Design a protein around this motif. Structure first.
Motif, PDB file in Angstrom:
ATOM      1  N   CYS A 139       0.866  -1.156   0.000  1.00  0.00           N
ATOM      2  CA  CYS A 139       0.000   0.000   0.000  1.00  0.00           C
ATOM      3  C   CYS A 139       0.917   1.223   0.000  1.00  0.00           C
ATOM      4  CB  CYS A 139      -0.888   0.005   1.247  1.00  0.00           C
ATOM      5  SG  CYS A 139       0.028  -0.097   2.810  1.00  0.00           S
ATOM      6  N   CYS A 150      -2.679   5.438  -2.932  1.00  0.00           N
ATOM      7  CA  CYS A 150      -3.837   4.532  -2.995  1.00  0.00           C
ATOM      8  C   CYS A 150      -3.931   3.841  -4.369  1.00  0.00           C
ATOM      9  CB  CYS A 150      -5.128   5.294  -2.691  1.00  0.00           C
ATOM     10  SG  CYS A 150      -5.212   6.002  -1.033  1.00  0.00           S
ATOM     11  N   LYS A 171      -1.744  12.872  -1.069  1.00  0.00           N
ATOM     12  CA  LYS A 171      -1.040  12.406  -2.277  1.00  0.00           C
ATOM     13  C   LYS A 171       0.182  13.234  -2.676  1.00  0.00           C
ATOM     14  CE  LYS A 171      -4.294   9.470  -4.419  1.00  0.00           C
ATOM     15  NZ  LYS A 171      -4.784   8.812  -5.623  1.00  0.00           N
ATOM     16  N   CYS A 206      -1.751   9.769   6.180  1.00  0.00           N
ATOM     17  CA  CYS A 206      -3.116   9.403   5.787  1.00  0.00           C
ATOM     18  C   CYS A 206      -3.974   9.322   7.039  1.00  0.00           C
ATOM     19  CB  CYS A 206      -3.130   8.041   5.091  1.00  0.00           C
ATOM     20  SG  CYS A 206      -2.041   7.901   3.651  1.00  0.00           S
ATOM     21  N   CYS A 249      -5.625   9.848   1.899  1.00  0.00           N
ATOM     22  CA  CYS A 249      -4.174  10.089   1.926  1.00  0.00           C
ATOM     23  C   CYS A 249      -3.799  11.440   1.328  1.00  0.00           C
ATOM     24  CB  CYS A 249      -3.414   8.978   1.182  1.00  0.00           C
ATOM     25  SG  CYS A 249      -3.289   7.433   2.112  1.00  0.00           S
ATOM     26  N   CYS A 260      -4.404   2.008   0.338  1.00  0.00           N
ATOM     27  CA  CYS A 260      -3.874   3.215   0.958  1.00  0.00           C
ATOM     28  C   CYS A 260      -3.123   2.927   2.228  1.00  0.00           C
ATOM     29  CB  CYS A 260      -5.023   4.153   1.353  1.00  0.00           C
ATOM     30  SG  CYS A 260      -6.190   4.600   0.054  1.00  0.00           S
ATOM     31  N   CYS A 266     -10.173   6.616  -2.177  1.00  0.00           N
ATOM     32  CA  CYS A 266      -8.881   6.446  -2.855  1.00  0.00           C
ATOM     33  C   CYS A 266      -8.249   7.760  -3.288  1.00  0.00           C
ATOM     34  CB  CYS A 266      -9.030   5.575  -4.105  1.00  0.00           C
ATOM     35  SG  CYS A 266      -9.557   3.873  -3.847  1.00  0.00           S
TER      36      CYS A 266
END
Length: 442
Positions: free
Chosen positions: A174, A178, A260, A232, A258, A211, A245
């Protein structure tokens, strides 16, 4: 995934050092395991592929549950590491070849503990993590990455009983993107709605993503490098679907669980273009090996404090090299990751501070406190051509606008089909890994 019986799983031995004081370390006899995505997936009682090229077999895998019952992932024998996957070890040095010719492209690997049955979990708060690296053969479009993720130590075996291989078979990946390209998630084939990635003969995307928190020590080639925190909410391995996601393609990058973008310190992006590069008059010469030192400072200087600062320095040919600094008018000259640096720089760049929304350095630290798995990889980027790391991003942005220019690479660089020909023999080396108290690893 079930485990296949065609080939024994044989991870590569890789000793690291655990240190108590400068030059006072002991060997820890660890090993390297290949991520389950790169494994042959075939019928449990035969030789028939369940996955070929970038597609699952629809007769064997009409549903994830049926796929999982019918199929198994198999082992990597020692001979196949170099011959098939481009992985090798010499002493305490690990080498990963980008393209290995039946033709393998990129690799992701994890550090196992001395039992070779669990990932070596690193509790990183109030500690120092150090290694030697060579990225001299990696140019624009490639990334030789070393990073930590909040995987389970057993790859999810205890949570997902259909996962028979666990850490031994490199399962449970993970990260803070994600990713939907993970083939096995929560012990099940991620075969539902599987879609090939155009121009990627080996990869696709399934219904679910996976994730978890991510601490990027090293995202790099010879042109640019970065280190980045990705908290996250929550930090632990979480299978996602829909908005959770934070999929790029549905406009959800900032709507998921999360962070990103992460909070990055990337020397070139922070406006020091002369710090790091392929030549002897850069401060840090990427044509030669060097040592990367990372220190994870807490609020009270103990293992119980909150994560407050990610500090960085380098050693090259015995010369200590302190980190570069943020270099913009009216901005403090930060040389580390802190909440304040993240707020100030993202403010300047006009980037949404999702790092702060996800709980910031404190939340990143909670992942680090529980323990994270070490990942070593080499890859090209079929989504964004690595322009985020080493070029102008967005490509159409003005390079004089703070945050746009991340390296000297042309915006036409990093096309996977081109880099897979031009940089087929690129090899990243990670070696002489050392872990201990702050000040103990050099």
């Amino acid at each position: 995934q079930n485990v296949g019986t065609q080939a024994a799983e044989e991870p590569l031995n890789l000793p690291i050092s655990v240190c108590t004081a400068p030059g006072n370390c002991q060997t820890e006899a660890d090993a390297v395991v290949l991520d389950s995505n790169w494994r042959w997936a075939h019928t449990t009682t035969g030789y028939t592929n369940c996955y070929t090229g970038n597609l699952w077999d629809t007769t064997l895998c009409p549903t994830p549950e049926t796929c999982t019952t019918n199929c198994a992932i198999d082992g990597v024998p020692l001979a196949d590491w170099s011959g098939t996957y481009g992985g090798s070890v010499t002493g305490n040095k690990f080498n990963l070849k980008f393209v290995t010719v039946s033709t393998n492209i990129g690799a992701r690997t994890f550090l196992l503990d001395s039992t070779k049955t669990r990932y070596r979990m690193f509790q990183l708060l109030n500690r120092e993590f150090t290694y030697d690296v060579d990225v001299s053969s990696l140019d624009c479009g490639l990334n030789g990455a070393l990073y930590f993720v909040s995987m389970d130590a057993d790859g999810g075996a205890a949570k997902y009983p259909t996962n028979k291989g666990g850490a031994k078979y490199g399962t449970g990946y993970c990260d803070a993107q994600c990713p939907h390209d993970v083939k096995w998630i929560n012990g099940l084939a991620n075969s539902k709605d599987w879609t090939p990635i155009p121009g990627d003969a080996n990869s696709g995307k399934g219904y679910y993503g996976n994730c978890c928190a991510e601490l990027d020590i090293w995202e790099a080639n010879k042109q640019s490098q970065a280190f980045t925190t990705h908290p996250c909410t929550p930090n632990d391995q979480t299978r996602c679907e829909g908005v959770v996601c934070g999929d790029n393609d549905s406009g959800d990058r900032y709507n998921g669980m999360c962070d990103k973008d992460g909070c990055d310190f990337a020397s070139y992006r922070m406006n020091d273009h002369t710090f790091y590069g392929p030549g002897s008059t850069f401060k840090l010469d990427s044509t030669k090996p060097f040592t990367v030192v990372s220190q994870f400072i807490t609020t009270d200087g103990t293992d119980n404090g909150d994560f407050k600062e990610f500090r960085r320095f380098y050693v090259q040919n015995g010369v200590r090299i302190e980190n570069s600094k943020v270099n913009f008018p009216g901005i403090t000259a930060y040389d580390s990751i802190t909440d304040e640096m993240c707020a100030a720089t993202k403010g300047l760049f006009g980037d949404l501070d999702d790092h702060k929304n996800k709980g910031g350095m404190k939340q990143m630290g909670e992942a680090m406190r529980k323990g994270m798995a070490l990942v070593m990889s080499i890859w090209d980027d079929h989504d964004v051509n690595m322009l985020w790391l080493d070029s102008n991003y967005p490509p159409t942005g003005n390079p004089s606008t703070p945050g746009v220019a991340r390296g000297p690479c042309p915006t036409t660089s990093g096309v996977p089909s081109e880099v897979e020909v031009t940089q087929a023999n690129a090899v990243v080396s990670f070696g002489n890994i050392k872990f201990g108290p702050i000040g103990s690893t050099v």
